[PDB]
Assembly symmetry: D2
């Protein structure tokens, strides 16, 4: 029987690359998405064309709220419903936007989105994954630049730091169950659709190893390593995949 994985925010970009590589490795996949329904369905269609009945989509908002625990439980339930097991959880979904300290969304909403997606949803997903339970593991998508953060991104940075804390705490606590918990920390990988080429190039020029951003596949490669049998003693580790960006002084 093939193992099964949940990847959050998997419709596009890094999440899609992770889902694709897991699928190529032989996993059945739950493609979680929030707004990108067409892209999620397009991906699931492609994966099911390769191997029938090996991909499903699952919609959920991962903003913090009193129903978030139930939503996260349902994402894990959806993997069991489709595939009868859940071996791997990848916490990839993430809100990212500035929240300046000095001056449409209310600050309450910004907290709920930035802390919810980057930290609280991963925590609740981790609880539900563990409660339901071989090579079991969780991979959290972190950020290599958390100690040298983008200016005016405090709430986002708080969220990613909290995710490091979760990775460590959950690795410690879930080790007796044989559930490994690790992270992959990109530097600059895919730049946003909205960003102009000149701004993209400004970031690219900072990277020592090739003056280019990580491909989505390069990020996925590290995730696949951590979920593999080649990482079976690794827990509580966060692997930077940043081309040396974090080593470069101001």
């Amino acid at each position: 029987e093939a193992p099964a994985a949940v990847v959050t925010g998997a419709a596009k970009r890094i999440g899609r690359a992770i889902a694709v590589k897991l699928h190529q490795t032989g996993y059945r996949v739950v493609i979680h998405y929030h707004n990108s329904a067409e892209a999620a369905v397009s991906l699931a269609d492609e994966l099911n064309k390769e191997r029938s009945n090996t991909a499903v989509v699952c919609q959920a908002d991962l903003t913090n709220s009193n129903v978030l625990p139930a939503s996260c439980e349902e994402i894990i339930n959806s993997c069991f419903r489709a595939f009868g097991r859940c071996d791997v959880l990848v916490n990839n979904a993430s809100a990212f936007y500035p929240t300046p300290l000095v001056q449409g969304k209310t600050v309450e909403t910004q907290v709920a989105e930035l802390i919810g997606t980057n930290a609280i949803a991963p925590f609740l997903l981790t609880m539900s994954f563990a409660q339901r339970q071989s090579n079991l593991s969780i991979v959290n998508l972190c950020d290599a630049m958390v100690d040298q953060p983008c200016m005016a991104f405090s709430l986002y940075n708080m969220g990613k730091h909290a995710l490091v804390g979760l990775t460590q705490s959950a690795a410690l606590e879930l080790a007796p169950y044989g559930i490994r918990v690790n992270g992959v920390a990109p530097g600059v990988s895919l730049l946003p659709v909205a960003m102009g080429e000149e701004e993209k190039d400004k970031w690219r020029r900072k990277v020592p190893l090739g003056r280019r951003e990580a491909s989505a596949e390069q990020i996925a490669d590290a995730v696949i390593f951590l979920v593999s049998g080649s990482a079976q003693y690794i827990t509580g580790s966060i692997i930077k995949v940043d081309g040396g960006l974090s080593l470069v002084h101001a």
Copy 2:
């Protein structure tokens, strides 16, 4: 005119020692409290007996909610109302209890643990900066964030987030001359709520004297960071842990 400081969770224990030392150093102080009204007022009475009209109290729940931003704005406003200025913010108040991953609702635990340790510090930081000399913020962190207590994930998440706030706010508020630093205790003032067996077990782990920190020793590092002797220091977290975090399993 004397500078003024807000200390959250200042009625007891480390917060109280911080408020006392700031006041002894010459600050006027806002003593924030949640449940400990009697102790907050007793502290204010003590400090005001030393110097009239130099200590006030301010009540607020720092749990995350729809009203937390307003509560935090009002804590900062209370300092400006009482004293006409706010030079120092100490983010000390903190919920701390286990939240096991496998088996209050969990969402209430998120609100309390992440609210007190991270979101309230952020909102207080925003309000402090917006309302603006030796201005600074000190966040009470945790020397054991990378070797956390078992089954304290949400607490540990909150303290990690507070490290991130310390760094992000240091970076962003530096142009305004506002420094942002942290003090990271190991074990300090182990409470009655711990058993004597657990208390001795922790104390014996501490390389420097096999004892916990006093609240005053924690306060000493806060006083340094707000002082003129720290005017180039921002984004720094000082462990006050007697070497505890250096000790392997």
Copy 3:
């Protein structure tokens, strides 16, 4: 045409497992050794039985001295003489013993051995490796997951391993324009000494959250193989803990 790797301290234990896995992956290997000649040669003979002319040995003391730079240049040169190329360097060789700060080796010898093997030799080997490269080139340094929670009375050892982290970062930064990646693997508790009492071994094993056991040499080698692979080609300046969670455990 097959790539080539130098592994220092490759006769036994973790270095041996790394050399074996690299060879299984398709590398030709230089098996460096200091005192363990019989084991280095037995490994080479095993690997050459698998594929002829794919393993050589190279003897050197990696203690710090005025001749260390020449010794390290010669190790790298040996790979070029054997195989015509040198694609991977693994800095594994390491002295490890206590050096108490307070009350038969002299302290200058302990400095030389502990700082030489763990830090200075890796630096000189890195220099020589890079100079010959003035494709998937990379260096892997064997670090230590417990450098911030060190064994009592191991100051010089711990200094050496911290220095090795600094080399990893500095060399990653500087060698990036040459396409040479520089990374680390940081064991927690892996192979214990055979002569250590099982009761003492078990004291260490019981500390490890993930399985209450030490890492095998092969599990350490798995992380090295990942870092030198095509699946790690954007990774430089990273140190992967392979510690079963040990470093997360408070006192």
Copy 4:
């Protein structure tokens, strides 16, 4: 009655400022120096004019060699010879220059100077200080930029990383003797005339807090705190005094 301190590389710049502040605080001081004999003797004269018999100079090369242990023992011995006690050791002396990995000093000399001054001499001085033994402590001058080093400074950076390791290891091991071991990590401070004006200006503009370097006195202020009674539970801590420099991404 008055406690005594050894400060290495104390003739000039940051070491001088540390020696002056310790002296103003009530310490008797050993002013160690290597080449700066005239400055060392002038400083001792200044401090002795303020309080007689409270300062001496001590010359030593702190380059690694087989005689370095004897030299370090002699520096501590010089404190006992002059003052009858040695309460504080400040490891400040430091060689700093590039050592590129790819191509008048030989590489062995570069290793000896950079690793000796920044790491091995601090270790040997720490040994001798501890063996010869209240508020006893050691302060190591570290570097806030150890994880974002200057390009082509590998040996220097290795030395400073080793000094972090010593700070931790010695804090752990010397705690039972009541000796605290801490560090102060500058970013940019008191940029020297020898540095080109253009390079000085470039580094100053990187610093978030005031777009300026630290004065020597600001560095010394952190050393004074760590040796004081207000730091009596602090050991194994390294305090950045960097104006936020280390927080700034490339």
